């Protein structure tokens with residue numbers, strides 16, 4: 087892995103800047119239709135970016151709702167074995183590219199008993215189990231260029247962005263699907279046992295997933311404002327103690343794409 | 357360091373198959389109480405890990421672990437005598453490999469015992485707590501044994517851990533205990549893994565108890581996860597080798613020797629229990 | 640460099656060639672203890688840079704030998720926090736070196752977030768127990784081959800925070816008129832270096848944790864493992880925010896400042912504890 091220090095991040099950023107003229111203000115990490123809505127877009131496969139982590143995923147530049155965006159199509163999940171530096175690099179690259187707001191979605195298990203399949207849970211906070219347990223993405227020498235040794239995670243999930251997202255949902259008639267909640271990261275890749283889910287629920291967790299927190303931590307560390315939503319893709323089984331016709335349509339994607347586009351449209355500009 | 361991929365697992369499996377004709381249906385990982393199990397194995401071949409190329413090496417004080425093939429209650433078994441505990445510093449691949457080797461050897465059921473601290477206040481020293489579920493603290497915390505490239509040959513990227521502790525096997529174990537007059541010693545419970553090797557502080561025990569944990573140990577889950585991942589059915593029991601101290605203001609301290617002593621004392625019972633379970637496993 | 644008997648001996652032997660002081664008490668300066676080293680008399684200051692095979696922190700930390708309240712001490716000025724990326728062996732080595740040097744009692748301070756709602760900024764929370772989240776999660780400092788020379792494979796953490804030393808510390812606080820600042824509590828280690836989210840703090844609090852920090856437990860574990868008695872205190876350098884809706888937050892400069900304000904008190908406290916430690 088190449089260290090996510092100022093020097094390497096600059097190199098990758100500079101390379102990307104030679105491929106696109108688009109200075110992204112908003113970065114989006116796709117937990118997939120979004121990219122499709124992007125206009126006047128350049129698609130840069132990771133494979134074409136020297137020193138960029140490989141998953142091939144694409145970096146997509148263009149405009150969305152009249153805003154310059156960089157979209158990550160292909161994430162680096164820790165359960166895959168990616169290093170802290172590999173996961174951190176793209177976010178820090180976004181920082182150097184001009185990204186001020188990071189919007190991310192993920193799939194999560196609904197722990198909260200009031201959640202419904204396909205609900206949206208806006209992250210208003212998280213519990214970073216790996217981070218509490220000495221697998222925090224920031225462990226290692228602090229990269230001072232990007233942020234402080236001991237980042238505070240207060241307002242990690244920008245309250246204004248959260249308010250905005252909620253309003254946009256409300257206005258476009260799907261406020262009923264939208265919740266705010268605490269996301270706990272399970273390092274994965276095992277789904278959580280019922281005992282784990284029960285514990286996580288009782289810990290005050292609403293949704294559980296294997297992603298996002300590390301990117302959020304890096305983003306916050308370098309001052310990028312964060313908006314994150316979990317799609318409740320399954321209801322966690324809490325009880326350790328018959329198949330039907332199932333529709334698994336990418337309609338949450340369309341809704342979520344629309345939601346993101348409409349949020350981006352209303353983001354304050356400069 | 358040898359990756360627990362299809363290629364290496366096959367190599368080890370193939371080597372073992374050149375040493376024994378026994379195709380094991382049941383794999384048994386001897387924890388505590390099970391030291392004796394191996395002894396009951398009939399028509400057995402004992403294959404020290406040292407004699408298996410690319411097989412992980414363990415030792416009990418310099419004495420290499422053994423893979424023991426033979427029959428038990430008329431069933432072909434492979435018995436692991438010598439486990440790889442993560443607190444020893446073994447890698448994910450080192451711990452996973454033997455289970456995947458068992459898979460290739462024909463193992464369909466994994467039976468494992470371990471020593472555990474009794475968190476549940478209703479547990480008694482030497483009670484048997486059948487795992488009906490677990491809390492994989494290392495797993496939640498980014499030290500899951502499956503972290504890394506998924507080995508597709510063995511199982512899926514995101515294994516579900518529903519019915520990880522096969523409910524039918526649990527039911528069977530309980531019946532066998534009941535029938536042989538020690539149902540009173542047998543509980544089902546949630547096992548939480550402490551990575552270890554420190555025993556849990558009273559504050560840790562209190563927390564774990566309040567998290568809904570019944571017993572705590574430093575083993576087993578990683579093997580269970582690998583087993584489940586490759587579709588091996590799992591039966592696991594904790595011997596309550598000590599009652600967890602929940603109160604920091606207290607003399608009573610966990611110690612490995614007492615732990616070994618409870619295993620030693622219950623080993624015969626547990627051996628018998630396992631043998632009688634194996635006897636009634638569907639074939 | 641593995642913290643085995645051989646390497647620890649080498650480092651210890653080197654140090655013993657630099658100082659005649661056989662330390663009975665080792666002190667790890669956290670927060671409130673920058674000053675401690677200053678009170679040390681007849682002291683030799685050995686920068687880590689001058690100790691072959693000794694871990695390097697910073698500039699450069701010092702090993703300080705001398706007497707404090709008439710007792711021979713070794714003071715660590717410069718710790719190895721796991722969030723910096725130090726290995727188990729790097730963190731364990733100095734403690735094991737202390738063991739070989741003659742250390743019988745380890746006194747350590749740290750900065751911590753006050754989870755317990757009854758805590759005040761600048762309170763002292765004596766550790767009476769801990770929750771070693773990294774340890775529960777397979778990042779225990781002892782993971783790896785056990786170094787038998789130093790201790791057992793499965794150390795018990797009963798009375799990890801020596802009750803007698805805790806009693807003493809409380810008495811000393813009481814006698815010197817700051818018992819009101821002194822609490823005993825459960826310390827939970829967050830691996831860090833992020834401060835805890837409000838959701839994390841809430842969880843930790845409900846887990847029965849009183850203070851949260853990113854240090855100490857690994858040293859305590861190594862100390863206990865090799866039979867060194869442990870006394871540990873957290874300075875409450877910030878009150879944990881439990882509510883995400885709250886502009887209010889941890890500020891590291893305020894942590895440092897709060898720590899520093901109490902250093903004199905904490906130095907005095909430690910000196911007065913050391914003074915009353917039973918001797919041989």
Ligand SMILES: Nc1nc(Cl)c2nc[nH]c2n1
Nearest residue numbers: 471472473550572573574
């Ligand atoms: N983690 C752990 N804790 C306790 Cl109390 C034990 N007693 C026997 N094995 C054990 N493993």
Ligand SMILES: Nc1nc(Cl)c2nc[nH]c2n1
Nearest residue numbers: 750751752829851852853
């Ligand atoms: N992990 C952690 N949390 C809080 Cl509130 C702290 N305050 C001082 N050091 C600290 N370390």
